[PDB]
Design a binder for this molecule. Structure first.
Ligand SMILES: C=C(C)CCOP(=O)(O)OP(=O)(O)O
Ligand SMILES: C=C(C)CCOP(=O)(O)OP(=O)(O)O
Ligand SMILES: [Mg+2]
Ligand SMILES: [Mg+2]
Ligand SMILES: [Mg+2]
Ligand SMILES: [Mg+2]
Ligand SMILES: [Mg+2]
Ligand SMILES: [Mg+2]
Lengths: 340, 340
């Protein structure tokens, strides 16, 4: 697994080389290399690795030649670039301080709001790689449309996330279970969970609408759990482990935690949450954290993680066939009980 | 021409309807409609109109059925959406105040840096329209790749533009004719001039590499002239006419004007430019404008506009064949002597 991660990371130098190969644009290409090095490295590479692992499990080993395997790790890196693009942009919009153990790319002196165009370049690099390696393949168009559709779905999710979290406005009424499930389905589940398995499926020749629908049932549910864990870690995670500083409380976000708080709060506790949520004051944030702990939300999260795991396992039993259950089980093992 | 513009604008309501048609995403789709209405309307629609006019001139009238014409005005609107995406993002990065006679979308109270995701949605809408109307056409993939390549080229151009214009740093050494030509080729010429004619060419079945190369020779030169005019208007244009407020001097930009100033300045005038360029102080900006006027740069621009027009006309004579010269002449007439 760590050796699998290591093999995937060793292909990054080739990805950068092929993307940063007209002398007039030299300075811009040198900036793109810096944008790639800073923002596509430091994560867990779960999405990129899922493409590589799923491709190997879905394709007959006699058909896994050197060019086929290169295409698989390249498409894995395309999914990492999609993630990099959204994170660079999301860190500006969320006013975040750190990412993957280092200062946010936009927080770097000399970068600032120029990171908007840098994010756009990362997105552009996906289609440059798809054209360079997969142009002659029968699944080329299926991959292009899958990455474009995954970006649109993420952007729609980001729009819902930002509309539910207006700055300077009390938004407790908007923080419902229904709203939450809708935000996380689009902003996380589609591109972080459906996209990597769907890409390996199209590369394996599995283009069937019914097969993709079945994979989607498992993967969108896994994505919802993953975002619930991300919301828990925003406040109760170790920043030395998570690599990022939480901002959901200050940013008035429709977090899984605030939705649970609102379902369990007394009128007195509702007032405390109303007066202290969505504000930059450190003592107001500390007051919301104290309310969550009073309502035993960390324990409520532990019980949800268990119930959700069993539910996802039941969905693998129902919808994995005819794909190897290991395709979905490998990703479940990688995200369950994770504190990073 | 104004009737042609009117026919094109009358199709916008249909574009919005088809793009803003899952009740859970309702609030986000309502935000997308607001993003579309605010940012894709108010311009001159030259790019969108060029697609429609070029398609009509390149396709035999017996092959111009109702569905074919709809595809043409839809692809015209895709080019307007590409422009909208880049302008929303460019206005944030350039710290601009107004656009198309109204306050910049990001300057709107309640929008702010959420405009980054709004720009991404506008870009996403291009591929949604291409899929909705052109998916079954033989040129579908050619159009997808052309819009993706045009975005990458624009982003590379924007990177060069921002690298040459660092905030708080004296960048006069970097402002060369060579650097300028490179920036404007990528940031403007490819997507504003090559993209609309190339799209109509692929829709007409003209996919030949040599035909696209010849069209490119004319159109990249036209794009350079158009950006030189844009730089002139940034300072010497009427904001009631241009619809936007200039920021090139304050933003330390490699403008055509500053390049010309540096070629004509004495050591005393160079010192004046060095002490006053790239700064927010109104009196420093007024000092640079006074230097430009002392060096008769508005007259130097008038002489360049004439010389460039003749050169572009000579390029149409050389490279228009076998395409109707009217394809290129119509766009030249629309941009030459324009003060908007
Ligand atoms: C979609 C969300 C929850 C953002 C972070 O994803 P990861 O937690 O997988 O971050 P990296 O490993 O890529 O850094
Ligand atoms: C590529 C540059 C010069 C930006 C503005 O283009 P236009 O001057 O054509 O602006 P609109 O008509 O679309 O508003
Ligand atoms: Mg965030
Ligand atoms: Mg966010
Ligand atoms: Mg989070
Ligand atoms: Mg600008
Ligand atoms: Mg600009
Ligand atoms: Mg300008």
């Amino acid at each position: 697994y760590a050796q699998e991660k290591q093999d995937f990371v060793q292909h990054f130098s080739q990805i950068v080389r092929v993307l940063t190969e007209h002398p007039e644009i030299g300075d811009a290409i040198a900036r793109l290399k810096e944008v790639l090095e800073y923002n596509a490295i430091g994560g867990k590479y779960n999405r990129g690795l899922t493409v590589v692992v799923a491709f190997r499990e879905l394709v007959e080993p006699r058909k896994q030649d050197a060019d086929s395997l290169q295409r698989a790790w390249t498409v894995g890196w395309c999914v990492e670039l999609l993630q990099a693009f959204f994170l660079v942009a999301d860190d500006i919009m969320d006013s975040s301080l750190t990412r993957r153990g280092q200062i946010c790319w936009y927080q770097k002196p000399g970068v600032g709001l120029d990171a908007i165009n840098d994010a756009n370049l990362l997105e552009a690099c996906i289609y440059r790689l798809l054209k360079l390696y997969c142009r002659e393949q029968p699944y080329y168009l299926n991959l292009i449309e899958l990455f474009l559709q995954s970006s649109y779905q993420t952007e729609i999710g980001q729009t819902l996330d930002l509309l539910t979290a207006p700055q300077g406005n009390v938004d407790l009424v908007r923080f419902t279970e229904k709203r939450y499930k809708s935000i996380v389905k689009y902003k996380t589940a589609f591109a972080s969970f459906y996209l990597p398995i769907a890409a390996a499926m199209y590369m394996a020749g599995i283009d069937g609408e019914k097969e993709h629908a079945n994979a989607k049932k498992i993967l969108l549910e896994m994505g919802e759990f993953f975002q619930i864990q991300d919301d828990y870690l925003d406040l109760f995670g170790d920043p030395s482990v998570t690599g990022k500083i939480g901002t959901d409380i200050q940013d008035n976000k429709c977090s899984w935690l605030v939705v649970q708080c609102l379902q369990r709060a007394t009128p007195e506790q509702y007032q405390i949450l109303k007066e202290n949520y969505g504000q930059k004051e450190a003592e107001k944030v500390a007051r919301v954290k104290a309310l969550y702990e009073e309502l035993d939300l960390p324990a409520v999260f532990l019980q949800y993680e268990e119930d959700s795991y069993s539910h996802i396992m039941a969905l693998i039993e129902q919808y994995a066939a005819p794909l190897p259950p290991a395709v979905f089980l490998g990703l479940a093992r990688k995200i369950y009980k994770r504190r990073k």
